[PDB]
Design an enzyme around this catalytic site. Sequence first.
Site, PDB file in Angstrom:
ATOM      1  N   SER A  61      37.493  36.300  47.577  1.00 37.34           N
ATOM      2  CA  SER A  61      38.047  35.643  46.402  1.00 37.34           C
ATOM      3  C   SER A  61      37.257  34.429  45.931  1.00 37.34           C
ATOM      4  O   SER A  61      37.536  33.943  44.834  1.00 37.34           O
ATOM      5  CB  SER A  61      39.506  35.263  46.675  1.00 37.34           C
ATOM      6  N   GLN A 117      47.388  42.438  44.277  1.00 39.25           N
ATOM      7  CA  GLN A 117      46.355  43.460  44.202  1.00 39.25           C
ATOM      8  C   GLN A 117      46.593  44.416  43.043  1.00 39.25           C
ATOM      9  O   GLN A 117      47.733  44.760  42.714  1.00 39.25           O
ATOM     10  CB  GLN A 117      46.324  44.305  45.484  1.00 39.25           C
ATOM     11  N   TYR A 147      49.326  33.809  42.553  1.00 39.10           N
ATOM     12  CA  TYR A 147      47.915  34.147  42.729  1.00 39.10           C
ATOM     13  C   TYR A 147      47.728  35.659  42.738  1.00 39.10           C
ATOM     14  O   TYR A 147      48.433  36.380  43.453  1.00 39.10           O
ATOM     15  CB  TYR A 147      47.456  33.560  44.069  1.00 39.10           C
ATOM     16  N   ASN A 149      44.766  38.969  42.105  1.00 37.65           N
ATOM     17  CA  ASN A 149      43.526  39.641  41.708  1.00 37.65           C
ATOM     18  C   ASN A 149      43.714  40.437  40.423  1.00 37.65           C
ATOM     19  O   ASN A 149      42.789  40.521  39.609  1.00 37.65           O
ATOM     20  CB  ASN A 149      43.072  40.602  42.810  1.00 37.65           C
ATOM     21  N   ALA A 315      38.594  35.870  51.315  1.00 35.76           N
ATOM     22  CA  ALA A 315      38.482  36.747  52.472  1.00 35.76           C
ATOM     23  C   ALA A 315      38.333  38.194  52.029  1.00 35.76           C
ATOM     24  O   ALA A 315      38.802  38.595  50.957  1.00 35.76           O
ATOM     25  CB  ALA A 315      39.718  36.644  53.365  1.00 35.76           C
ATOM     26  N   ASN A 340      37.381  37.295  59.146  1.00 33.36           N
ATOM     27  CA  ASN A 340      38.435  36.656  58.352  1.00 33.36           C
ATOM     28  C   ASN A 340      39.335  35.868  59.299  1.00 33.36           C
ATOM     29  O   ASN A 340      40.234  36.426  59.922  1.00 33.36           O
ATOM     30  CB  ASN A 340      39.237  37.717  57.598  1.00 33.36           C
TER      31      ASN A 340
HETATM   32  C1  LIG Z   1      40.544  36.905  48.003  1.00 28.34           C
HETATM   33  O1  LIG Z   1      39.762  36.672  48.912  1.00 28.34           O
HETATM   34  N1  LIG Z   1      41.614  37.663  48.153  1.00 28.34           N
HETATM   35  C2  LIG Z   1      42.770  37.596  47.261  1.00 28.34           C
HETATM   36  C3  LIG Z   1      43.708  36.609  47.954  1.00 28.34           C
HETATM   37  N2  LIG Z   1      42.924  35.367  48.097  1.00 28.34           N
HETATM   38  O2  LIG Z   1      43.764  34.355  48.661  1.00 28.34           O
HETATM   39  S1  LIG Z   1      42.933  33.436  49.624  1.00 28.34           S
HETATM   40  O3  LIG Z   1      41.831  32.895  48.887  1.00 28.34           O
HETATM   41  O4  LIG Z   1      43.974  32.463  49.978  1.00 28.34           O
HETATM   42  O5  LIG Z   1      42.514  34.257  50.720  1.00 28.34           O
HETATM   43  C4  LIG Z   1      44.130  37.174  49.312  1.00 28.34           C
HETATM   44  C5  LIG Z   1      42.909  37.528  50.188  1.00 28.34           C
HETATM   45  C6  LIG Z   1      41.863  38.341  49.427  1.00 28.34           C
HETATM   46  C7  LIG Z   1      42.281  39.805  49.273  1.00 28.34           C
HETATM   47  N3  LIG Z   1      42.651  40.532  50.480  1.00 28.34           N
HETATM   48  O6  LIG Z   1      42.298  40.355  48.201  1.00 28.34           O
END
Ligand SMILES: *C(=O)N1C[C@H](NOS(=O)(=O)O)CC[C@H]1C(N)=O
Length: 358
Positions: A61, A117, A147, A149, A315, A340
Amino acid sequence: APQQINDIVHRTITPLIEQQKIPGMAVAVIYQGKPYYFTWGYADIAKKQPVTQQTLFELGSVSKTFTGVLGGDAIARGEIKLSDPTTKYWPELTAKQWNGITLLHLATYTAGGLPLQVPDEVKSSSDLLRFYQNWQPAWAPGTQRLYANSSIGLFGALAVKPSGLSFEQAMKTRVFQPLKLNHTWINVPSAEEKNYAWGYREGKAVHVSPGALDAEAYGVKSTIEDMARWVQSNLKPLDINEKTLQQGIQLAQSRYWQTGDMYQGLGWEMLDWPVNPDIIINGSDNKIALAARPVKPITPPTPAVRASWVHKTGATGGFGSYVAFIPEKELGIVMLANKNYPNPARVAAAWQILNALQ
Ligand SMILES: *C(=O)N1C[C@H](NOS(=O)(=O)O)CC[C@H]1C(N)=O
């Protein structure tokens, strides 16, 4: 490196690696604008390949910082506005819940509950359209930060539409190439696979799987050298000659929303410096960082504040990355690891190092 930098880095990172059983790690400290590098362990355990300054790590991320800056560059080019409706760039997105959802909301996770996701089942643009058309918001836009993606991923995909370029081509031409990030990849070339570390999850070697909007949300791979340069560029955008990119870097550190003591940028997150270390350490735990939190708007967004702690975690299944910098102090850190391991341990180590060098 000055002895104070070597001292604090080895005193902090060595027990971290031992405690977390990290197989391989690269760290850059940016101090008075110059980078200092440190490497430990193995990019490939079974094959005994050491981590080097050319080892590629999955940023996860942390990729969102590149997406945020690319979006800021498009703003500065006059190609998009954050107040533009999502449907201006995807007119096929006709479902009524999208009325009122702007590029700002997508970029800042405030659209109203877009999920963490994109589902694994979503693979084509037709699948992606069905997914967004059938998504039902939990909240009105601009009220809760969740938060996601799927939120910033869609922002990145739409932000590049006026340019006529693919997201990958826009990122290469408008961000990577001007900043001389010659070993930063959305897709690692065949000839670079020898430099691509394996990630380690439960002892098994793994790489991130393809997924929809991966490039925009979590798909960049980079070296410790390119990441140090990326920090330098975000620390001191006035040295960037490409004016819209300089401006895009600045806009990604504007403060668009506040929740608690944190502010949401474009990709980057910010707190006023000096920070309370417990706030950033505990706030990085997934229990807080992935929770829905109420936001207050900042109208107009605060222009980038030099006395800020600016940071981002990331991660993948096999990698853990962290970047933090303080523009006022000309000070930054990148920590890349091929396991991770928990966010709070990353943030605690970074704060210990930067606080000692301030
Ligand atoms: C990014 O690394 N991702 C989306 C989300 N990010 O939050 S973090 O920065 O606090 O890790 C969760 C982890 C990761 C993913 N598995 O998509």
